[PDB]
Amino acid sequence: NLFKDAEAEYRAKGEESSLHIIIFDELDSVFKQRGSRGDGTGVGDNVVNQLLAKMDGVDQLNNILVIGMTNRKDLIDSALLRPGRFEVQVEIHLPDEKGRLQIFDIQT
Amino acid sequence: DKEFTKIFRRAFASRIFPPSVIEKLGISHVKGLLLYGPPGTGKTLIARKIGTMLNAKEPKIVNGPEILSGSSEENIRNLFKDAEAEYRAKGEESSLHIIIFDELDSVFKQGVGDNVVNQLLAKMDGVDQLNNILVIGMTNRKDLIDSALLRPGRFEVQVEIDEKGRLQIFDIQTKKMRENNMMSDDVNLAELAALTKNFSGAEIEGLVKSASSFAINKTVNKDIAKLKVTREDFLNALNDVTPAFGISEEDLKTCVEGGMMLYSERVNSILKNGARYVRQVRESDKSRLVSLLIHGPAGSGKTALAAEIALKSGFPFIRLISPNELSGMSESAKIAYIDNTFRDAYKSPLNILVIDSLETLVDWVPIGPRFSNNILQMLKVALKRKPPQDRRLLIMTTTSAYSVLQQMDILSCFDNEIAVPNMTNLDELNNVMIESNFLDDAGRVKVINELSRSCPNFNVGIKKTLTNIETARHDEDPVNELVELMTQSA
Ligand SMILES: Nc1ncnc2c1ncn2[C@@H]1O[C@H](COP(=O)(O)OP(=O)(O)OP(=O)(O)O)[C@@H](O)[C@H]1O
């Protein structure tokens, strides 16, 4: 239900469609490994399948950029770490001394 | 092509004969074909091409993970309705139906994933004699396949899935940019192929996009006509993408990083003997296994010499077994790593294998004495095993504890020994000094005079000489350092 606006604008205006960006906080919360097992309600697996279907079989939606912020990459399902799905991964590490000075300046 | 011939000749031959003969004799057509290999080999491509090439029924492509849904069993059983009805209508005349299940191991692991197996096994064999259905199972991980399916009569045939092809796919990708006169002539595609050794198609697309990205950056902080992709972007973008392979040929090149000096003729003699043995292995058809031992005082330099001989050999296959690779492993892991390293040397017409510091692999310490008997026995057995038919090995092992090996009685396993004595005459020191351009002529003439009056017999290893020269270069370039230091290391 989140992608309806992008689909509508794409269908309406071809390549003139503006850029729509949606960002998923706490990505590892729901999209854990889809082979966890447990013999119970499967709503924790069809969620990944739905997102993967709307992200891979996009039907040529080329005006969407999803940003995912997390603290533990290892827990993310491996199926989403491949070309065409979350390609670029940027690591943010601890600041350097000059960055420390910049942060101190900004804070004060 | 070889697999393409095997699968066609052996499996897909029975259907050619007139149907009545098959019906009468009772010969049974092979049912299962398992194509396996690393990701990106194109297993899906081959699966698709097989159906069209053989003029078979339109393939039913179904994703492995999508199988997840009693409705899963309903789908599995419904899959076979068309083939069952078609065979019922005609019989032996039914056309060949092919079903491909991508990522078989995803759902067919050792309870939807169990009921699916139940349905498939119930339909596949027993009451049914449908020889018109061919199921192709493709998986990147062969070990994960259920044992219930790994048995005779099911998936009998297993098939395992280059530089030129890589260049061709590069051309395929580049066509659009090259045609529109936006590519500089300096870019050598073959060079990029030589750089990309362990990359798959998606990685190639990624490198293309990143290299273009650098050209994009060059413009943005109406001259769009000058947007050109340069070789520098291709060189720079290589840092983003990464492969998932490994090579040890580099390890055999770093061991000689310090280079040769030819400070004495015996070095040339040893090299000559090595080139003789390599030729002997190359030419004789009876000598299918040659073992050599290279022994000498510690620090004289033995790994570098063997690595040099191996690099001069030029054989298709060369490898090194060094302690560094085994560090941190448990015993049951070392014994398997050593076994695998040997088992991978029997798949090529000519092979060279180098073993480094034999006594260190065995964990020898003289206080006990303590050592690991299992690895010792494994190596002793391996060093005498003849390779399979028509394949030839050359093994060179380096050691520094000749006496210990004598005690263990392992010495009977080697065919010949080569001794490498460390330099003792000041002439060799002069050669090394001129080779290392340590000092001018006057200093290099005074050093010998200073030494001759203090230490007539030199007896120092080359490694120590090099390190001493390096450390003396800084404190006091004049002789007043070196002669002392070396006298201290005598
Ligand atoms: N025959 C040789 N001629 C010239 N340089 C050599 C020769 N052998 C070894 N060296 C130099 O010695 C350096 C280190 O020697 P190397 O590692 O082979 O010693 P080693 O005696 O095998 O060592 P270890 O003491 O670990 O048993 C190499 O970088 C190489 O440049």
From Swiss-Prot, chain B:
- According to its record, what are the GO cellular component terms? cytosol; Golgi apparatus; Golgi stack; mating projection tip
Q: Which GO MF term does the entry hold, naming one?
A: ATP binding
Keywords in UniProt for this one? ATP-binding, Cytoplasm, ER-Golgi transport, Nucleotide-binding, Phosphoprotein, Protein transport, Repeat, Transport
**Per its UniProt entry, which superkingdom is the organism in?**
Eukaryota
List the subcellular locations: Cytoplasm
Residues the record lists as binding ATP: 37-44, 296-303
- What biological processes does GO assign it? autophagosome assembly; endoplasmic reticulum to Golgi vesicle-mediated transport; Golgi to plasma membrane protein transport; inter-Golgi cisterna vesicle-mediated transport; intra-Golgi vesicle-mediated transport; macroautophagy; SNARE complex disassembly; vacuole fusion, non-autophagic
* Binding partners and assembly: Homohexamer. Binds to SEC17.
Task: State its role.
Answer: Required for vesicle-mediated transport. Catalyzes the fusion of transport vesicles within the Golgi cisternae. Is also required for transport from the endoplasmic reticulum to the Golgi stack. Seems to function as a fusion protein required for the delivery of cargo proteins to all compartments of the Golgi stack independent of vesicle origin.
User: What does the record's miscellaneous section state?
Assistant: Present with 5920 molecules/cell in log phase SD medium.
Please report which protein family the annotation says this sequence is part of: Belongs to the AAA ATPase family.
Task: Name the chain's protein.
Answer: Vesicular-fusion protein SEC18
